Structures are given as structure tokens and as C-alpha cells.
């Protein structure tokens, strides 16, 4: 089962908020796929 990141929020910057994004596309698609 594909990695979920962790979701963020007080520190939801520019960065993790992408790389959350990425992330988190990565874990649909690879949800979807599983």
C-alpha cells in the first residue's frame, strides 16, 4: 500500500504545501492503481 503523507497545516509552507501536493497525487494515483 502507497506511502499517505502527512497533512499539513501550522506549517504549511510553499514547500511542503507542493511537496505535499506531490505527494499527495502520488498517493491517489497510486491508490487508484493499487
Same mark, same amino acid.
Request: hydrophobic share 30%; glycine share 6%.
Given at each position: 500500500?502507497?506511502?499517505?503523507?502527512?497533512?499539513? $497545516?501550522? $506549517?504549511?509552507?510553499? &514547500?511542503?504545501?507542493?511537496?505535499? &501536493?506531490?505527494?499527495?497525487?502520488?498517493?491517489?494515483?497510486?491508490?487508484?492503481?493499487?
Amino acid at each position: 500500500p502507497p506511502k499517505k503523507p502527512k497533512k499539513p $497545516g501550522a $506549517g504549511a509552507t510553499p &514547500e511542503k504545501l507542493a511537496a505535499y &501536493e506531490k505527494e499527495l497525487a502520488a498517493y491517489e494515483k497510486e491508490l487508484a492503481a493499487y
